[PDB]
Amino acid sequence: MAIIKEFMRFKVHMEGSVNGHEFEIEGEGEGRPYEGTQTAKLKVTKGGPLPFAWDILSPQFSKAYVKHPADIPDYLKLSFPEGFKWERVMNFEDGGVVTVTQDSSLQDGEFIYKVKLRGTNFPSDGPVMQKKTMGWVASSERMYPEDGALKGESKQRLKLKDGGHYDAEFWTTYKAKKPVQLPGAYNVNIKLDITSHNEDYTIVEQYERAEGRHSTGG
């Protein structure tokens, strides 16, 4: 609680490929870990302009910034200064798949995020490779402890330019680098917004608000 201050910055580096197109992204963000809010400014540094929808990348750029009530152990804040790692699978309803691995650490008073991403099997005709998505609907991640780690599962939904939707299921495992106290089951409500971007999405800003609450599930 002297480690995680009420205002904290972070730096993120992502390396990945989607349908074999390789790219890199570098960004910096800031927020209020106890209030559950944060912003990030991302820049594509290789592989730009991306030939696919920014939205499949936006959820990978920070769960030290989730507001927790006092009776739910904040495992990810407790993992610092060593930090934690996470691995995620996103299965989309048209067969697209994204797998992500991430390492979070704290260096010189800022969080450092390193992300690796592989998106595969997206249809050339689908909304991801045709850039038809329009942001994620607000969602809720169901959290539970298992095998010494914190797991989260959620149904997610992208809005589309044609007024329709495009659904996905997310599975994530979060593991502290030292044994710290795990919570029971609970829900994390999340709203993730793209607050501005340039025309080809090589420069993007995001905002996220996340808060944990007891199930059953408002």
UniProtKB/Swiss-Prot annotation:
Belongs to the GFP family. GO terms for biological process: bioluminescence; generation of precursor metabolites and energy. Signal peptide: none annotated. It holds the Pfam family GFP. Fluorescent proteins have become a useful and ubiquitous tool for making chimeric proteins, where they function as a fluorescent protein tag. Typically they tolerate N- and C-terminal fusion to a broad variety of proteins. They have been expressed in most known cell types and are used as a noninvasive fluorescent marker in living cells and organisms. They enable a wide range of applications where they have functioned as a cell lineage tracer, reporter of gene expression, or as a measure of protein-protein interactions. Contains a chromophore consisting of modified amino acid residues. The chromophore is formed by autocatalytic backbone condensation between Xaa-N and Gly-(N+2), oxidation of Tyr-(N+1) to didehydrotyrosine, and formation of a double bond to the alpha-amino nitrogen of residue Xaa-N. Maturation of the chromophore requires nothing other than molecular oxygen. InterPro entries: GFP, GFP-related, Green_fluorescent_prot. Coiled coil: none annotated. It comes from the Eukaryota. This is Red fluorescent protein drFP583. Keywords: Chromophore, Luminescence, Photoprotein.
